[PDB]
């Protein structure tokens, strides 16, 4: 499935270091049900002009920009290039590349539970659950004291992104080691068909 | 990734219905153009469809974008003689900007002649007169020139003349011989010409 | 918008054509197309930006530059006798997606020049009899002995070239049909009005225009050079 | 601004002096792939995605022209306005829970990047690493500055302390960012 | 219902500040099933003699309580005594006094949201979702972001006790407000028959 | 050490010099009651509690009688050895969510007391405030050592704060736990 | 908050079963007890039950613990006549040291005599004799010495003397009139003599 | 362990009576109770510290004092008749829950001390027939006529008191049984051998102890003034 790239048009023409921006950014909101398209030109940090789908055209968003938006909204076969985009783009990536490609990466989580200090029955403290390397994003945690669910004096860290297509976050919780307990981990992800569940037995 | 058109060569008479089936294969969401070339001179626009059920129109030509059967068939109500000419079909790959053309149909939209009025002159050299020419013109659309048997004679095939300053067109074809044998009379006996051809004797 | 030179060039093989494409539009991408009945239009080469290239369907065989924004040059270093076709040089613009092609550039490749020679044009005034019988005058102008087959036939009354009243072959013809190196004729008609033509201050003129050696071509023999010139034949009104 | 798939395509940039152009596809946050503008060839980052689908690298070189163009237009119609730098955060962390004598990545993660360039390296005890890392490419934000990710292939051992040395017109001196196992 | 107390044996007769403390503990697990009784004397933070239903008898901790232990455990009337309060003083109070007074109360938990800094939608800020004044200390809460439970940026206190038989908790939520979204605090304790939740649109 | 329910009964306590004792009972951590051995009356934490249930004071009268002794004894048969004194810490906190011009509670927790002999008092500004102090008894830790609440009747105002200043032998000098509302 | 015992006076022959019931009320669980007085003397400790199914003895008394029918019931499986006192059952509240007693149950345990032999004689005064005295002695433990009918006539319960230097027990009642008028065999008309009772003069 | 003083004592309706209790078994709880038959033993006071005392069941009508933790004393500040009862003073180890009680102190109220009366004693020599019958000789002593109604009656053969072959009424008897201030009347038996007895050597003697006024009492009447005293009648060995 061949990627489809959003097309920028070409202004025109009337120590230092400048930076300038373009991109097409498509939101997919419910799938391809509801779609925004927006296309933005930055020139250092800040948005000169842009297209939204929800306006129908480019506008200028500071004076700099109003010569270009003036002119792509003249001529016809760049406007419509522009706006069709929403379908030429956005749509055709998502129902394509995308749906084949990022929209159906599951990555399992690793967990693992760890103790902070060096065990000492019947002394304060702190157990830490890893859930590592998954995608997507959504992920849930839950503690359990032999038994049942525990929500108070746990913390958990919050969704970190590794940068290569993967995510992990922390999960602490406050208590003490009596003999006889038994603190399990339970994370409930999209890959997984059945929650996972690692178990510490004090 | 191309464009194919089912036909390559359309004749027919002047209000007639015009359809011209194009179909295609593309590795993206292509713009889907139509082109137009009268004879001696490069294509134009025509008019062009950047998305499903979108309609491209003009000069009484349009089409409609069909992803499903990936079709651009173009059509027109009643072709009028003056859209004599080629019609290409084109895709426009959006990635690198490049155009695949179709083969390209050739019309000859055929005039209309209520009243023919046959008739072949005998026309004469300026200053000296090495050969003779004898005119074929004023006759019907229906009428067909063939080539003669005979070397020493030729003849050029029907051409459509048209006056716009009076809207009268006329069917006209020439024929001319280097030898002194040569009769009007004759010039054209290898053609099925009307059974009341005029044939002043000059 | 788009120009094109030569409007056409004969050639022998192994010879070097250069076909050049100026623009005005101010659009940064330009193609060359080659055009052949039973292909319709090729991508040769095409560029974007001001010094690069890029090869489209069917390359082979020729060379493209881009020196400036409104030029780009299209060169086939060795002449072939199967790169005989019609060039077409168009651009859009970056934003858009819209081809404007020029008038297009037809290029013959003959194997021996000696092949080729100049027409001979003639007009034939219109005759007593239409003009009797129809009220309308219809001179005919008449291209022969040519080759290439190659040339384009306009009409021009009284300075002014008319399109209105005027029919010319679609394509030339054959004035020996079983030979190889075959000359061509073609004909056109002008019909004009009864009186138009029975004005003695009327003048009629045919211009042919021929495509043949350059300037730049060897050229020892005995009759004239057939450099691509203009050949015509003029007519007066006959006051009847 | 909310939607529950967000796809960033064809995103150029460019700055000047010096000709320095980036161009890569994104896709919640992740780049799908990236265009070399001098191999002139599409590196994906899941190369098992580059199998599945495809995008044709002059595309990009195309869209880099564009964009090349419109910073000359733009740069003089503001008759030439300097960009004003910025003070690039950092952050260390292990990609995996750390275990002694075990292969693992230490991650760092640079923030508020303006402009795109910027020079992340390791330090191994102030030594100094230069094998097994990895950079990705700059990554856009929404205030339009940039953030990019170095990643260090290393085993950690008892005592051997790391570092994220960052340079940047920015800063007046690199910043250090240190962790350690302990 | 009448509270029963342990009673202290008296030892046996043979700047400068001495702390002495003396008290009965009564392990009950499982309700009254099991029972476990051990009454504890000390003597400047040292636990010097002590009595263990798990030993049935009065053992000195250090030197200084041989002469207590060899003493009370001799003296029938005594060890019975203090051997009989596991269902004199555990029992009793337990299945009396506790069973119609802490064993029943049940104080509903009053909950609020309220946000860290002054809001700015887009902006990242805190939500704080305060639980107080409940009894008795199982409790569990949880956040939602319009409609689905998160457990990613939450982080929750320990069990505070007020020391006046109630207990509070503080749960914060890392979030950032974008119109059009809802966050919802959700709790659950014994003393409420339904689930008790507060809401809080951004 | 494990149990779903602990009661601990007839705590008695008692120092030298001073004949200072105190008797309660506890539950869950929580105290039940006390006997105020000067009013000779049991006084219930929660009064809706001695509704339901009682204790006769005699009982810790008594019961404070044998502690009492026991100190003798133990204190000659040791041949006086005098307490190691601990350094006690505090906490500040307010009972219920803060809300400016609304009655609330400012809770100080102090903790590892001992001996259980303290003095806790509260300052606003700097000022020391007197009223609407309610003390709770001494509460036992598994250590041996105690920990003791007061409570600060309070209207948070906009810039008020306020301390909880400790006096214990165990410091050289009072220790202040600072709260503030902002 | 109490104790009660069901009799309050039981007598019975040598050898016989004893059984004193005694029933309790308590708000706590407290520790039974059973004191014996002997006739001159005060009351002293016989054995306690600090709980259930618990249970306490002393010199062949025996009592169990009942938690579920709040009871602690005394019982001793052959009786001795030196057995004879009252017996008290007590309780203790354990929070303030209190002992709450029963009400107490007088116990007569009649002695064996094998060999009996019922009657009565006429016992004469030293120097001056105002009035006369009837002995009623030798008789068994069946006989029971009623009141007279007659006011002018007194007469004492039954009376077991023991003379130890010849294991010899021997029952014996007195009654005595001021009159000139009394009858030793009329003494004791208005009660059960024995059939056979000796009667001299 | 616990004595009780006095061992009795007789008091006049309005009168102050002091009962005092000392312990040596050195315990810290020790208490009043008071008996009488259809009530067995109701508490009074009791006290567990050295100052302080704390009331029973019936506290009302009497006052405690424990000056210190081996004397507990009880008072009655007004005699009244309703207070005729023994009293027992007790003692248990705050360590334990055994009570420990003294001999005891009867004490009783009367209207008039002009009434105490006397006991009248007399000695009752065995039967000719007994002896002849059993070989055992039987004496009978007889008090009658005292009141109140509390005496001990004793035996003494020889200068030695003997508990051997003697018997003695349980609880008086009543002289007049529907009458208010009726005297009271208790036998005992002594028995002996038949030849004990026919030893004109021996000496048997019957002691009644009565308890009534004391000197400290108001006398001003015209009988003596019946104080506590002993009352006896003798006789010795008859021939056989």
Not at chain 1, 107 to 115: K, R
Not at chain 2, 3 to 30: K, M
Not at chain 2, 51 to 57: I, L, P, T
Not at chain 3, 220 to 231: F, L
Request: charged residues 20%; aromatic residues 12%; glycine residues 6%.
């Amino acid at each position: 499935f061949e990627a489809q790239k959003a097309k920028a048009n070409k202004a025109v023409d009337g120590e230092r270091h400048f930076v300038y921006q373009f991109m097409g950014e498509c939101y997919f909101t419910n799938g391809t049900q509801r779609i925004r398209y927006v296309t933005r030109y930055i020139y250092n940090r800040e948005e000169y002009v842009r297209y939204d789908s929800d306006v129908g055209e480019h506008r200028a968003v500071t004076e700099l920009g109003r010569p270009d938006a003036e002119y792509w909204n003249s001529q016809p076969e760049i406007l419509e290039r522009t706006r069709a985009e929403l379908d030429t783009v956005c749509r055709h990536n998502y129902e394509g590349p995308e749906t084949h490609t990022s929209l159906r990466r599951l990555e399992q989580p690793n967990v693992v539970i760890s103790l902070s200090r060096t065990e000492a029955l019947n002394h304060h403290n702190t157990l830490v659950c890893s859930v590592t390397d998954f995608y997507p994003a959504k992920i849930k945690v839950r503690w359990f004291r032999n038994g049942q669910e525990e929500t108070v004096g746990v913390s958990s860290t919050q969704l970190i992104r590794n940068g290569d297509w993967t995510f992990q976050v922390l999960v602490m919780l406050e208590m003490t080691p009596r003999r006889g307990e038994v603190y399990t981990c339970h994370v409930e992800h999209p890959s997984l068909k059945s929650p996972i569940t690692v178990e510490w037995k004090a | 990734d191309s464009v194919t058109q089912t036909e390559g060569n359309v004749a027919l008479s002047e209000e007639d219905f015009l359809t011209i089936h194009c179909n295609y294969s593309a590795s993206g969401y292509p713009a889907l153009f139509w082109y137009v070339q009268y004879p001696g001179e490069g294509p134009q626009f025509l008019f062009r469809a950047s998305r499903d059920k979108e309609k491209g129109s003009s000069r009484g030509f349009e089409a409609t974008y069909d992803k499903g059967t990936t079709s651009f068939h173009l059509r027109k109500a009643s072709v009028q003689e003056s859209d004599s000419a080629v019609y290409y079909c084109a895709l426009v790959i959006s990635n690198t900007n490049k155009v695949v053309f179709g083969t390209g149909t050739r019309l000859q939209v055929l005039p209309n002649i209520q009243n023919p009025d046959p008739a072949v002159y005998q026309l004469r050299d300026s200053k000296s007169s090495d050969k003779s020419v004898c005119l074929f013109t004023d006759f019907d659309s229906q009428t067909n020139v063939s080539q003669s048997k005979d070397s020493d004679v030729y003849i050029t095939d029907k051409c459509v003349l048209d006056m716009r300053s009076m809207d009268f067109k006329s069917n006209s074809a020439v024929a001319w011989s280097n030898k002194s044998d040569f009769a009007c009379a004759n010039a054209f006996n290898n053609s099925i010409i009307p059974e009341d051809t005029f044939f002043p004797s000059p | 918008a788009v120009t094109q030179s030569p409007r056409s060039k004969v050639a022998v093989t192994g010879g070097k054509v250069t076909l050049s494409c100026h623009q005005t539009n101010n659009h940064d991408y330009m193609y060359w197309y080659r055009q052949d009945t039973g292909h319709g239009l090729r991508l040769i080469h095409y560029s974007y930006v001001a010094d690069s290239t890029e090869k489209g369907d069917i390359p082979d065989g020729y060379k493209a530059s881009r020196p400036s924004q409104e030029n780009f040059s299209l060169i086939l270093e060795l002449a072939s006798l199967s790169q005989t076709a019609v060039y077409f040089c168009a651009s859009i613009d970056s934003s858009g997606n819209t081809l404007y092609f020029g008038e297009g550039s037809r290029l013959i490749v003959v194997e021996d020049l000696k092949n080729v020679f100049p027409p001979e044009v003639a007009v034939f005034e219109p005759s007593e009899a239409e003009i009797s019988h129809t009220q309308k005058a219809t001179l005919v102008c008449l291209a022969t002995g040519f080759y290439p087959d190659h040339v384009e036939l306009s009409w021009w009354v009284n300075g002014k070239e008319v399109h209105s009243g005027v029919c010319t072959d679609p394509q030339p013809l054959k004035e020996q049909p079983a030979l190889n190196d075959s000359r061509y004729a073609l004909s056109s008609r002008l019909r004009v009005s009864a009186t138009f033509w029975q004005n003695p201050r009327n003048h009629f003129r045919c211009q042919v225009q021929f495509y043949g050696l350059s300037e730049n071509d060897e050229w020892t023999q005995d009759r004239a050079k057939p450099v691509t010139q203009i050949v015509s034949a003029e007519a007066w009104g006959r006051a009847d | 601004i909310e939607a529950d798939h967000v796809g960033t395509y064809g995103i150029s940039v460019y700055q000047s002096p010096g000709d320095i152009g980036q161009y890569t596809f994104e896709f919640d946050g992740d780049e799908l792939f990236y265009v070399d503008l001098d191999k002139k060839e599409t590196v994906w980052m899941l190369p098992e995605f580059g199998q599945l689908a495809s995008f044709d690298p002059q595309g990009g070189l195309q869209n880099i022209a564009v964009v090349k163009h419109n910073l000359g237009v733009l740069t003089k119609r503001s008759n030439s306005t300097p960009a004003t730098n910025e003070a690039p955060q950092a952050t260390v962390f292990p990609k995996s829970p750390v275990l002694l004598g075990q292969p693992n990545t230490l991650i760092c993660f640079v923030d508020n990047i303006f402009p795109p360039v910027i020079n992340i390296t390791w330090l191994r005890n102030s030594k100094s690493v230069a094998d097994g890392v990895y950079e990705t490419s700059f990554f856009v934000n929404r205030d339009y500055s940039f953030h990019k990710l170095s990643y260090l292939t290393f085993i950690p051992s008892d005592d051997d302390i790391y570092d994220c040395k960052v340079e940047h017109w920015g800063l007046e001196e690199p910043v250090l960012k240190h962790w350690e196992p302990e």
